């Protein structure tokens with residue numbers, strides 16, 4: 001009964017889909033049964049209609065239902081992700097990746113969902129590769145990385161091979177669509193907490209709704225300068241997800257003594273340049289990049305706390321203390337070194 | 347210009363800049379657009395809501411790439427009778443029947459046409475079933491027009507470069523802005539027409555495109571949804587003359603037309619719809635004849651607008667259309683059309 005003309009017609013009529021229709025569509029896409037034209041029409045039509053949390057949740061659900069999972073009982077109940085949509089139009093250093101290393105060094109289990117560049121000069125995966133970290137590990141070895149090192153990296157194309165038809169279309173049309181939301185929503189380890197960047201201000205709330213439905217503890221963040229991270233150049237909008245509900249907040253780092261930075265102070269380069277930036281921060285270099293890394297690490301720790309009960313300002317103060325200490329003690333630098341060793345000993 | 351630029355502008359619900367729609371269409375027409383890009387553009391353009399300028403650019407590009415007719419072979423007063431189709435009703439081929447009657451009345455007709463998309467039989471299918479050569483090239487359409495009084499430009503024959511767009515249309519199977527282009531891309535470029543639009547909220551856009559060309563056109567939408575002048579109720583007419591458009595409500599009851607039911611205009615496959623043509627041309631009285639005469643008269647009114655007064659124009663149109671059938675001229679013109687193609 002479901003068909004492309006039905007679903008696409010409903011969307012072009014600016015109507016929300018019926019329950020299960022978005023899922024049907026995504027499943028057709030993920031099983032190689034959709035024509036490129038159908039994939040593109042669907043992505044564009046959903047985007048222009050304004051996707052609902054129900055709809056985006058169905059898309060992400062289908063992706064997760066096809067993904068390679070991690071082995072049973074290898075992901076702690078309190079694992080966290082630090083990942084964004086990307087596509088903010090700014091070539092920054094890899095802030096989520098740097099933050100993730102610091103969070104893990106603070107003792108919070110991290111299973112990060114990641115990928116190579118799409119529109120930037122160096123993606124988190126590119127940069128980790130340049131640092132000597134193995135980005136190509138399957139379920140079993142990601143699980144061992146998490147256990148042994150404190151952090152695992154799930155390379156999206158490795159865990160989502162059936163997404164390859166959609167990815168090709170995303171590339172061909174260029175324009176961001178609802179598909180650009182799915183990465184942060186489809187970590188195959190299914191961590192229940194996260195700091196989740198959204199480049200698209202008008203779609204952050206919908207992302208937050210999806211996390212709320214699965215009762216995650218997440219901060220969905222959009223820098224008011226456009227960054228899909230908590231920014232240091234100005235305020236950030238946060239959609240705070242806890243206990244199945246979303247509430248919208250504005251966050252000002254000046255409240256925690258952060259000086260305002262300029263966006264060009266966070267600029268990145270190629271994989272080697274961004275790798276150097278990771279080494280500089282973990283080595284104790286003070287300055288704007290460190291500040292942005294500590295701020296986002298703290299945010300992820302706050303999300304982790306919310307799995308409990310948790311109070312906002314004490315949570316942030318503790319998160320900032322822990323993030324800063326994880327760098328200052330050398331723990332974060334050492335953790336990266338241990339991560340690199342781990343991959344070379346497989 | 348680029349796909350990310352243009353698609354991004356559309357997904358931001360912004361009208362395009364001058365020339366951008368044309369750039370896009372030309373990419374599509376030169377085989378330089380990926381199916382995904384074709385599909386994204388068609389959907390994005392549709393959901394943003396296209397403007398007359400934009401649709402005009404699209405049609406302009408198609409006409410640039412189309413096979414033209416030979417110089418000085420289309421009369422300045424040639425008329426088209428063609429609609430968007432996709433009105434969700436499987437009717438007999440009212441435009442095609444009206445076209446024959448109009449030609450038989452002596453008004454030069456160069457009809458743009460095609461096979462079925464959503465229906466059981468398109469005008470081209472029905473003409474084929476009647477024995478008409480539908481796939482003639484430019485030289486022979488011009489001869490048909492001169493010698494028979496009607497020519498049929500088969501869209502696939504004259505718009506080869508459109509095949510990639512056509513394939514994507516079929517694949518996504520939902521109407522888009524592309525569904526507006528048929529009536530706007532007759533390669534003979536007739537300056538008058540009776541032009542049906544299934545999509546009430548886009549008829550004004552189509553009328554705007556014709557206004558830009560200073561065509562004399564009646565863009566029509568039956569208030570029952572028909573992409574023809576209907577006989578079951580009133581119709582909306584976007585009348586185009588002197589580069590301006592005015593919206594009218596039209597009731598054929600004012601000309602003595604009894605109200606019909608939509609089911610009475612229902613059609614079927616090419617053989618059945620061909621039989622309906624033969625029936626009407628043979629003098630059969632009924633709702634189908636009425637609808638044919640009404641739309642034939644509409645086209646004659648548009649032809650007259652190249653120069654007349656509205657109500658007198660309609661009276662004359664109805665008279666000429668009825669007489670074209672009743673004298674047998676219409677039936678004989680069809681026979682002559684068939685013989686032409688065989689020789």
Ligand SMILES: O=P(O)(O)O[C@H]1O[C@H](COP(=O)(O)OP(=O)(O)O)[C@@H](O)[C@H]1O
Nearest residue numbers: 084086087094095096097118119120124
């Ligand atoms: O090249 P763009 O278009 O900007 O997209 C990149 O940002 C995404 C999220 O990046 P991450 O948040 O995972 O990592 P990071 O912030 O850089 O450390 C990555 O999947 C990558 O596709």
Ligand SMILES: O=P(O)(O)O[C@H]1O[C@H](COP(=O)(O)OP(=O)(O)O)[C@@H](O)[C@H]1O
Nearest residue numbers: 429431432439441442460463464465469
């Ligand atoms: O099958 P659907 O979806 O209805 O579309 C058909 O109607 C178009 C216009 O038809 P016409 O107006 O040219 O001819 P007609 O009214 O039928 O005599 C044709 O190109 C054909 O694609």
Ligand SMILES: [Mg+2]
Nearest residue numbers: 088089090091
């Ligand atoms: Mg960026």
Ligand SMILES: [Mg+2]
Nearest residue numbers: 083084096197
């Ligand atoms: Mg990030």
Ligand SMILES: [Mg+2]
Nearest residue numbers: 433435436437
């Ligand atoms: Mg119809």
Ligand SMILES: [Mg+2]
Nearest residue numbers: 428429441542
């Ligand atoms: Mg018609």
